[PDB]
Amino acid sequence: EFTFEIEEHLLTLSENEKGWTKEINRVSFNGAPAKFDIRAWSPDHTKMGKGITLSNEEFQTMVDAFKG
Amino acid sequence: FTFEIEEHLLTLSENEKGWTKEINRVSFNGAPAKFDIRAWSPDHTKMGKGITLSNEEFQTMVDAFKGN
Numbered sequence A: 001e002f003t004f005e006i007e008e009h010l011l012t013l014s015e016n017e018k019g020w021t022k023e024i025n026r027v028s029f030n031g032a033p034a035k036f037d038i039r040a041w042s043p044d045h046t047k048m049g050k051g052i053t054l055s056n057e058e059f060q061t062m063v064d065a066f067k068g
Numbered sequence B: 001f002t003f004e005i006e007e008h009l010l011t012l013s014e015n016e017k018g019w020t021k022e023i024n025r026v027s028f029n030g031a032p033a034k035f036d037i038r039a040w041s042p043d044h045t046k047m048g049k050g051i052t053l054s055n056e057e058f059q060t061m062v063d064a065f066k067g068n
């Protein structure tokens, strides 16, 4: 299907007046395992924007640091 | 094209070929530093695409993870 499916949405960091969003989601390319993704999303969610993907350790490393 | 890593906050990742995924305060092209997350060469002269965040966007992120 060659597409990016938001498996799960976690958080919404911002939103511009045009209705795009900065989100943190678990996102799945082409049926591959869902990775952690912080990215700009269009209102309907069809078009996505720029942003990084994270492996588990990266995210986990990250959140543990925002924690102690 | 110019940038500036003004503060390094956290390193999330090694890499087989020495890249590092980092959370930083980066300024691009003379613009005020924003919080920024991407991959960096071992010599931080090359990078991949990545997300940048306002501070409100960044704290919104940190908060949420402190609280789950």
Ligand SMILES: Cc1cn([C@H]2C[C@H](O)[C@@H](COP(=O)(O)O)O2)c(=O)[nH]c1=O
Binding pocket: B001, B047, B048, B049, B050
């Ligand atoms: C000098 C230079 C910088 N950049 C910036 C913008 C991106 O955030 C990052 C690399 O992105 P890229 O993978 O799309 O080229 O570095 C380029 O994309 N191309 C260039 O030629």
